Write a protein that binds this ligand. Structure first.
Ligand SMILES: *[C@@H]1O[C@H](CO)[C@@H](O[C@@H]2O[C@H](CO)[C@@H](O)[C@H](O)[C@H]2NC(C)=O)[C@H](O)[C@H]1NC(C)=O
Ligand SMILES: *[C@@H]1O[C@H](CO)[C@@H](O[C@@H]2O[C@H](CO)[C@@H](O)[C@H](O)[C@H]2NC(C)=O)[C@H](O)[C@H]1NC(C)=O
Ligand SMILES: *[C@@H]1O[C@H](CO)[C@@H](O[C@@H]2O[C@H](CO)[C@@H](O)[C@H](O)[C@H]2NC(C)=O)[C@H](O)[C@H]1NC(C)=O
Ligand SMILES: *[C@@H]1O[C@H](CO)[C@@H](O[C@@H]2O[C@H](CO)[C@@H](O)[C@H](O)[C@H]2NC(C)=O)[C@H](O)[C@H]1NC(C)=O
Ligand SMILES: *[C@@H]1O[C@H](CO)[C@@H](O[C@@H]2O[C@H](CO)[C@@H](O)[C@H](O)[C@H]2NC(C)=O)[C@H](O)[C@H]1NC(C)=O
Ligand SMILES: *[C@@H]1O[C@H](CO)[C@@H](O[C@@H]2O[C@H](CO)[C@@H](O)[C@H](O)[C@H]2NC(C)=O)[C@H](O)[C@H]1NC(C)=O
Ligand SMILES: *[C@@H]1O[C@H](CO)[C@@H](O[C@@H]2O[C@H](CO)[C@@H](O)[C@H](O)[C@H]2NC(C)=O)[C@H](O)[C@H]1NC(C)=O
Ligand SMILES: *[C@@H]1O[C@H](CO)[C@@H](O)[C@H](O)[C@H]1NC(C)=O
Ligand SMILES: *[C@@H]1O[C@H](CO)[C@@H](O)[C@H](O)[C@H]1NC(C)=O
Ligand SMILES: *[C@@H]1O[C@H](CO)[C@@H](O)[C@H](O)[C@H]1NC(C)=O
Ligand SMILES: *[C@@H]1O[C@H](CO)[C@@H](O)[C@H](O)[C@H]1NC(C)=O
Ligand SMILES: *[C@@H]1O[C@H](CO)[C@@H](O)[C@H](O)[C@H]1NC(C)=O
Ligand SMILES: *[C@@H]1O[C@H](CO)[C@@H](O)[C@H](O)[C@H]1NC(C)=O
Lengths: 88, 50, 426, 198
């Protein structure tokens, strides 16, 4: 690989989701008999929107989805005694 | 000049008063053998992260 | 000389004068934002005690300095890829442009990938990659290694192409869910309706708008190809990282109070009881240099993380939508933006709506016809000297003041500055 | 792995103190790591030589810890400012910013408390079932062009309707739904259809 010489993983041609990031587009996974495999990470299903100058897509329904998002606010306070730490 | 590395014949034309040779980082990258008047490149052996 | 803040411009303000633009010019501006920097992996033992045994035994007595430095460098290397992924992977489905370029006159062939060249990058992307540019061997031999990124340039180019195709084939609906096909004319009409301009302006001047867009893209390409200072923000980071590496690799040529800067020059002259002081001084100096370098790298990585978060926010708000934030997606009324790949950065092409030619007119806040005050629904009353009309704000399109254009509220003796004029009834 | 962003912060704050306590046990070139062991075996003139090294090492360790804590506190302050902005926008209002208050069209958000963090339950509007339709920029009835006020023209094959952009609700094209602007000789792609008059 461009990052180095990987020894211990079988090279496959199928493109899966990047589980263990190795580097330079190559990632590792634990699949089938079970062994570590290396593959070029994919980006998603190749789609092709049917574009036209007289075609429009308008939805006829909807789904209300709730997505959680976690954000850190604060951390634990720490008051290190600069004198007792060095001269206990 | 004690060291460790792979020696290789150099193409650098040292002048008759040019004994040693240093790299950019103040490291010896070329040396002249005292017995045989040949220029040898000093390159550290293969290494890398694992 | 004393720097001039700008040309003095006296605005002709008045209580009955208004200026409404009678034309417009589509302006495309560029913006460069760093997204990541070069990874670094400093071999602490090989940097402080390169090819030595007693030096390592003396360095092991200091503690876990090498361990924490390597851990901080690994954290930086991971967060760089994290930022790159959060910036260039805002979609979970790679799209593709249709083979027919029936957009309505707009020319996107200069920003879409070219199948002829091997690297699936556009012309502007190739220019940006060319405008950004042995010490590497010296750094590598001393323990300074550079790790490659997780996403190569081809994957970033494919992500940019997918974003561009989604933007040109679905507008902003591809970000909120499934991609919904829609002609580019109706998309531009929605964009114009977003900034407060009626959609008839586009359906009447589509040819002029397409010509202006093509000319703007051409001028952007010419500016990126002519000068060598447009991508200075990325070159600055590259040069800073290079100078930091050079300083870290040249600090090894200092004595730090010892008799020599080379460990072999000390281990071959002194014994195992007197060289300890010199080796300790060298280790202290090199460890202080490593700590300073790691602190600088952490601060620079925090700055790059802030820049990458800002770039991802701008991507999500300008490319996948139409942000009404002033001066955010370029100067002017933002219509749409196209992302472009760049070495360790991202470049946006903000398409903005800028008024061109304004004219003076007489305005009135209200109109009374039969003792009832009339106010415009969406627009402002104007007068060309003899007659009164009602037109939109960001464009001059006079219309007859009718009942379907104005609403009644109050009377005439309450509004200040109200004048008299008939109100048509359809 | 839902609260991994907080778990990592807690683990880093614990590992910093662990590394500091471990570096307290370093020798820094002295004869021993314990202070009392050096203060009770060597004379003052000889003990100060090791006390200086120990003090320098521990002071360097404390300075490194304080610098790391300052950088981490700056990162946490940035994250907290972002969280407060997201609160004030999504929770106390309705933000039109794309991909800010969750993926989709933000309806509302409910804050939730978490250990040393905050959790937002972003409610989004996502369209699910779409259908293809034939569109047109405007309509020609009596020489004039009719543009939609709020919506877009659609055709199911035989008739033309006007419906909103985010939901399929076909309605008859009347004068109250579309406005007149210009003529029918400049618009590209225009079609012909009758416009109802109530
Ligand atoms: C929009 O989607 C929802 C969810 O799929 C549909 O609700 C379902 O409708 C079918 C048919 O009446 C029922 O058998 C299911 O029990 C419903 N599911 C739920 C969760 O309520 C809804 O009908 C769809 N709307 C339209 C107009 O098709
Ligand atoms: C708005 O500005 C544009 C740009 O200047 C005008 O387009 C030019 O108009 C002049 C005179 O009509 C022509 O000679 C040029 O060839 C036009 N340029 C292009 C690129 O089309 C446009 O006419 C202006 N609109 C109005 C109403 O004055
Ligand atoms: C978009 O612009 C490009 C560049 O101006 C056009 O490419 C030109 O195409 C013509 C006809 O094939 C050639 O004679 C020119 O040599 C091309 N220019 C370059 C620089 O290669 C392209 O045709 C335009 N798109 C459309 C749809 O017309
Ligand atoms: C102000 O606008 C009005 C409305 O168009 C102009 O009145 C028209 O002027 C033209 C030419 O001067 C005549 O052919 C029309 O018959 C007029 N319309 C009416 C209803 O009288 C008026 O000339 C404009 N004034 C200025 C100074 O521009
Ligand atoms: C609009 O019309 C009203 C009446 O139609 C005008 O009010 C008159 O103002 C004059 C001068 O102040 C008075 O002498 C009259 O008694 C008023 N009439 C009434 C019925 O109150 C008003 O001045 C007109 N406004 C403009 C700007 O011309
Ligand atoms: C397109 O929509 C129109 C309006 O709903 C359809 O016309 C209706 O068709 C049904 C089926 O025979 C009739 O019962 C109604 O009387 C029709 N209404 C009108 C106003 O004509 C039309 O069939 C639809 N076309 C397609 C291909 O689905
Ligand atoms: C929409 O209707 C108009 C007028 O009813 C059509 O315009 C006529 O088209 C025919 C055939 O092309 C010509 O012979 C006439 O001279 C046109 N009349 C005018 C006043 O322009 C128009 O073609 C119709 N639209 C479509 C798509 O057929
Ligand atoms: C992958 O493709 C190469 C190129 O044709 C081929 O030589 C190799 O056998 C393939 N590997 C697998 C597992 O199919
Ligand atoms: C002795 O060294 C000289 C170089 O100084 C060399 O030319 C010569 O061949 C050497 N002779 C032997 C016998 O090694
Ligand atoms: C409007 O009036 C001001 C002041 O008289 C003048 O400077 C300006 O040029 C006028 N606008 C136009 C379009 O002439
Ligand atoms: C506008 O200002 C002028 C200048 O002072 C004044 O004469 C006029 O009455 C004012 N008109 C209104 C409606 O305030
Ligand atoms: C719309 O047309 C495209 C192209 O034929 C097709 O792939 C898609 O499934 C169609 N949409 C629906 C809802 O059937
Ligand atoms: C739409 O595109 C097709 C294919 O290029 C073309 O035949 C047709 O004339 C176009 N129609 C309009 C209204 O642009």
């Amino acid at each position: 690989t461009r990052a180095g010489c990987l020894i211990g993983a079988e090279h496959v041609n199928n493109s899966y989701e990047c589980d263990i990031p190795i580097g330079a587009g190559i990632c590792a996974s634990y699949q089938t008999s079970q062994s570590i495999i290396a593959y070029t990470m994919s980006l998603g299903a190749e789609n092709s929107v049917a574009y036209s100058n007289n075609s429009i897509a308008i939805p006829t329904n909807f789904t209300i989805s709730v997505t959680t998002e976690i954000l850190p606010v604060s951390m634990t306070k720490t008051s290190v005694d600069c004198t007792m730490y060095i001269c206990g | 000049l004690t060291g460790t590395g792979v020696l290789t014949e150099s193409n650098k034309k040292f002048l008759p008063f040019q004994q040693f040779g240093r790299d950019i980082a103040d490291t010896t990258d070329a040396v002249r053998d005292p017995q045989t008047l040949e220029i040898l490149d000093i390159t550290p052996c293969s290494f890398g992260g694992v | 000389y004393t720097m001039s803040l700008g040309a003095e411009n006296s605005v002709a303000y008045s209580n009955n004068s208004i200026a409404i633009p009678t034309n417009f010019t589509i302006s495309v501006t560029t913006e460069i934002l760093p997204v990541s920097m070069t990874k670094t992996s400093v071999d602490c033992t090989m940097y402080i005690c390169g090819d030595s045994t007693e030096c390592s035994n003396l360095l092991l007595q200091y503690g876990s300095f090498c361990t924490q430095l390597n851990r901080a460098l690994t954290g930086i290397a991971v967060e760089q890829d994290k930022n790159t992924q959060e910036v260039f992977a805002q979609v979970k489905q790679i799209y593709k442009t249709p083979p027919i370029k029936d957009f309505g006159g707009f020319n996107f062939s200069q920003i879409l990938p070219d199948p002829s060249k091997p690297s699936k990058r556009s012309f502007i992307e190739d220019l940006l990659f060319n405008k950004v540019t042995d010490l590497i061997c010296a750094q590598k031999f001393n323990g300074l290694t550079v790790l490659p990124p997780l996403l190569t340039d081809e994957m970033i180019a494919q992500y940019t192409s997918a974003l561009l195709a989604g933007t040109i084939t679905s507008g902003w609906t591809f970000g909120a869910g499934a991609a919904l096909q829609i002609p580019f004319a109706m998309q531009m009409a929605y964009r114009f309706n977003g900034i407060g301009v009626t959609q008839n302006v586009l359906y009447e001047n589509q040819k002029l708008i397409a010509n202006q867009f093509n000319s703007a893209i051409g001028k952007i390409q010419d500016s990126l190809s002519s000068t060598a200072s447009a991508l200075g923000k990325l070159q600055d980071v590259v040069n800073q990282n290079a100078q930091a590496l050079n300083t870290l690799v040249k600090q090894l040529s200092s004595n730090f109070g010892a008799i020599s800067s080379v460990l072999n020059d000390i281990l071959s002259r002194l014994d195992k009881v007197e060289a300890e002081v010199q080796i300790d001084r060298l280790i202290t100096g090199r460890l202080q240099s490593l700590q300073t370098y790691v602190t600088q790298q952490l601060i620079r990585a925090a700055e790059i993380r802030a820049s990458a978060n800002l770039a991802a926010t701008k991507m999500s708000e300008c490319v996948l939508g139409q942000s009404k934030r002033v001066d955010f997606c370029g100067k002017g009324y933002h219509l749409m933006s196209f992302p472009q790949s760049a070495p360790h950065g991202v470049v946006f092409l903000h398409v903005t709506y800028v008024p061109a030619q304004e004219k003076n007119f007489t305005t009135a806040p209200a109109i009374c016809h039969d003792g009832k005050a009339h106010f415009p629904r969406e627009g402002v009353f104007v007068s060309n000297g003899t007659h009164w009309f009602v037109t939109q704000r960001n464009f001059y399109e006079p219309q007859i003041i009718t009942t379907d254009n104005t609403f009644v509220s109050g009377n005439c003796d309450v509004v200040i500055g109200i004048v008299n004029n008939t109100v048509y009834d359809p």
